């Protein structure tokens, strides 16, 4: 069974492990441990025992930015990424958020296709935004409009 919950203090070491396993160029520890607290709606997905994924989001006004999503390699391509993303979107809609934003490596064909299938669109491109093992990569800036529902 899969259980999406808030990501709290106690959860951060497990997530930090996931951060370092799923990203070729992870955040720094300080940056990672610093993206919590006020205005963060941070979520984890638990599969049975293990934490399998996490997502870091910040809400300002009626827009949000997904700073980070990560499914641990052991748990990938099993639909948990989408599921977590879907829970987040529902949660942002109840919160009056109308636009979710994110950045993605231009060559992440996986992530892009996931986002596209969830309704994200390319807004703009930032050239050479990401480092690579041999230079830089473009960032695609993508916006998902979230329709307002009856409550």
């Amino acid at each position: 069974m899969n259980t999406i919950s808030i990501l709290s203090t106690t959860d951060l070491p497990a997530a930090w492990q996931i951060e370092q396993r799923a990203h070729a160029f992870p955040w720094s520890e300080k940056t990672f441990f610093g993206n919590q607290g006020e205005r963060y709606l941070n979520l984890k997905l638990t599969a049975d025992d293990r934490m399998a994924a996490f997502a870091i989001t910040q809400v300002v006004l009626d827009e949000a930015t997904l700073f980070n999503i990560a499914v641990d390699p052991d748990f990938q391509r099993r639909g948990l990424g989408r599921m977590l993303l879907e829970h987040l979107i529902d949660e942002l809609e109840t919160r009056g958020v109308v636009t979710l934003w994110l950045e993605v490596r231009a060559s992440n064909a996986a992530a892009i296709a996931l986002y596209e299938s969830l309704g994200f669109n390319e807004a703009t491109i930032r050239r050479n935004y990401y480092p690579t093992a041999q230079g830089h990569e473009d960032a695609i800036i993508m916006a998902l409009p979230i329709s307002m529902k009856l409550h």
């Binding site: 990203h23 955040w27 720094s28 300080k30 980070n68 999503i69 960032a139």
Partner: peptide, 6 residues
């Protein structure tokens, strides 16, 4: 993933 200089 957002990229930070931090």
């Amino acid at each position: 993933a957002r990229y930070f200089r931090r």
